[PDB]
């Protein structure tokens, strides 16, 4: 079980956040109804590597139980206009043996915090 995409590395002090309507990775095999979920910070650590933020679709992942909006540390919430607030059970999570991660891509003009870069 893993994110369908690659992480956004936080190179900065600022944590990941997106304006409403922004921050959902592009997946052409997903629909407008699906375009909603959360990013989970995972920090590696002897030194502390930069934090990595992984996107999971709503209703999937380590915080599958959280409803959209719930407050938990290291959980931030994103959605695209048109998404529906239903669990995305059909998309699910990625099994690394059978499938490999999708390079996270954000639409042109997406607003990112300082220290975040999208190829």
């Amino acid at each position: 079980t893993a994110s369908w995409f690659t992480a956004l590395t936080q190179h900065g002090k600022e944590d990941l956040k997106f304006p409403r309507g922004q921050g959902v990775p592009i997946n052409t095999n997903s629909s407008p109804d699906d375009q909603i979920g959360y990013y989970r910070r995972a920090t590696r650590r002897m030194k502390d590597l930069s934090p990595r933020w992984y996107f999971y679709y709503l209703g999937t992942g380590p915080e599958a139980g959280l409803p959209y909006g719930a407050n938990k540390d290291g959980i931030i919430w994103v959605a695209t206009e048109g998404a529906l607030n239903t669990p995305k059970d059909h998309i699910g999570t990625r099994n690394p043996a059978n499938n490999a991660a999708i390079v996270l891509q954000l639409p042109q003009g997406t607003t990112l915090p300082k220290g975040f870069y999208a190829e």
């Epitope: 695209t80 206009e81 998404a83 529906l84």
Partner: nanobody, 129 residues
Framework: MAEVQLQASGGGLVQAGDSLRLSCVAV?????????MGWFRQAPGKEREFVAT????????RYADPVEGRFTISRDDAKNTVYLEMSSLKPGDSAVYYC???????????????????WGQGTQVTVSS
């Protein structure tokens, strides 16, 4: 399927011309904020009918033709509740009323049934002549 996450209330038996006020409450962690919302109704022996949709901000609302001018849709995101204020009620407005969660940051143009999900448990409204 899933547990109910939207619950309508305030239905009753009323007489023609009376007004009623319905509420639909998100529960179990569900939020309605920054989502459009809808009210639908099922008359006895009849298909689901679009009644009203209010957009994500509350600026804008659309009503069905029969309900036009008599119903008013409203939202209070802080309490997670949507409301349908019904006036000069008619026997034909007799039905089961339920709300549904609409699309993220949507409104108005999206009034189809596929534009909403999940769907709420309803409350029965009966109007006598």
């Amino acid at each position: 399927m899933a547990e109910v996450q939207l619950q309508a209330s305030g239905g009753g038996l009323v007489q023609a011309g009376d007004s009623l006020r319905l509420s639909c409450v998100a529960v179990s962690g569900r939020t309605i904020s920054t989502f459009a919302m809808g009210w639908f109704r099922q008359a006895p022996g009849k298909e689901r009918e679009f009644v009203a949709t209010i957009n994500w901000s509350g600026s804008s609302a659309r009503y069905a033709d029969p309900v036009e001018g008599r119903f008013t849709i409203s939202r209070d995101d802080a309490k997670n509740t949507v409301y349908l204020e019904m006036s000069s009620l008619k026997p034909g407005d007799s039905a089961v009323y339920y709300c549904a969660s609409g699309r993220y940051l949507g409104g108005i143009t999206s009034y189809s049934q596929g534009d909403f999900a999940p769907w709420g448990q309803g409350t029965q409204v009966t109007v006598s002549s």
